Amino acid sequence: LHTQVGRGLLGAVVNPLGEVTDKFAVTDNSEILYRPVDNAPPLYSERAAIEKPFLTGIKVIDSLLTCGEGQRMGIFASAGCGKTFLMNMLIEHSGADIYVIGLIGARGREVTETVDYLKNSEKKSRCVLVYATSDYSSVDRCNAAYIATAIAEFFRTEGHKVALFIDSLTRYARALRDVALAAGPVSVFDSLPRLLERPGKLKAGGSITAFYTVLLEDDPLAEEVRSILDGHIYLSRNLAQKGQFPAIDSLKSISRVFTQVVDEKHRIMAAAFRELLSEIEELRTIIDFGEYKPGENASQDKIYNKISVVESFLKQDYRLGFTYEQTMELIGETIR
Incomplete structure (x- = not known):
């Protein structure tokens, strides 16, 4: 219900319980505060219009799928389409102040892979990782996304240009489905749109540019998610098997804020x-x-x-x- 926030989390790995279990970096700042994981999304008058581009350092994205500061972007990929490498490029070659990665329902190998990548990253001292392995319960898997979003929100209220990553919305949707099964005016399924409407640029604060990954079958959740978000990036397995990296099919991808940021x-x-x-x-x-x-x-x-x-x-x-x-x-x- 409440979690740790602050600059003291930079370079740390957070589990679904809000505690630090590992570190990929060390910072001389030890700021630790507490904020509720379930906060109300901003009022319409508190938001600002997406007008600044969020440069990613990736040519095809920055040229044809130009993201915006405060945008919510979908990353639709299959089994081996380089989704993790695409996220690594997004963190490595963009220019965000703080990065908050949220691994939902991942495997231990993938968590330690992201940690090993962050241990050798240039944005190493500016990242916070919130994980939830496949061993944790569904409640913990959803609370991981809520925790990551809460940390990103704290860094937004301080005026920082924050980039939130949620991997993935599919496994989070499964965990939320199991929680809803645990319950049978408030529905557990509503926690997905309310989670997706939390990023953005605030008039009185910084911004949260979010990247939600959605797994594809070799999907109704994927279609409704693409209807909620501000655009999607499609990673084609066909292009991936032809040696095209990044396997971005720009003719099947769009940024809804493109004409406003270029x-x-x-x-x-x-x-x-x-x-x-x-x-x-x-x-x-x-x-x-x-x-x-x-x-x-x-x-x-x-x-x-x-x-x-x-x-x-x-x-x-x-x-x-x-x-x-x-x-x-x-x-x-x-x-x-």
Whole structure:
């Protein structure tokens, strides 16, 4: 019902009970306070309009799926689509003040994997990890998401630019389902929308840019979640098996605040690049049909000789971060 917050949690690992069980960093700040995990979402007059971009350092996102400060973004992926590596890139190459990771229903190997990654991260001293392994009860798994969101909220009221990560909404939805089964004007199932409406940018405080991951089958929860959130990023298993990392299918992904966080020339270049991707796909299905010969259609040859530079722009090593100017420069070179 109440949990620890404060800068003293930076570099620490928190279990569903609110206590620190491990540390991936040490900080000279020992600020420890207590706040309720079940806080009311902000009033409509207390929120601000999403107008600033949340740069991620990832080219395809910053160029075609530009996130906003205070946005709630869905990350839809399958078994091996590089979702964990995508989250690692989001933490590593973005510019948030504080990161709060929430592993819901994960396995011990995955928790220790995230800890081992944070122990060698550059954002190491600015992260708080709240985990709940698959051993904990459903109540503990939901309380883990509530705890992470509460910590992120405290850091927001202090004016910090916070990035919250929830992995995943699927396993959290299962735990919430079991709790609802434990009960049979207040419904346990309502804890999912109320949880999703807590991030955002406050007029009197900082912001919480949230990334909720949703697992896909090799789903009604996924569709309603995509209806609640401010946009989604689709990680295609097809692209992942072709060697495309990040396996982001930008033609099946959207940011609902895109036109509000980028200017006009960015909009034009992004539209041109999306049309180029569409034409590239049409040429791909034409080639698969075996009806493409070099020399006949000059348009198909122009689009054909563009596949290399486009695929080169979409791909990005997980160790490299690109500034906004570099991203717009590269995408500008790609659509010539």
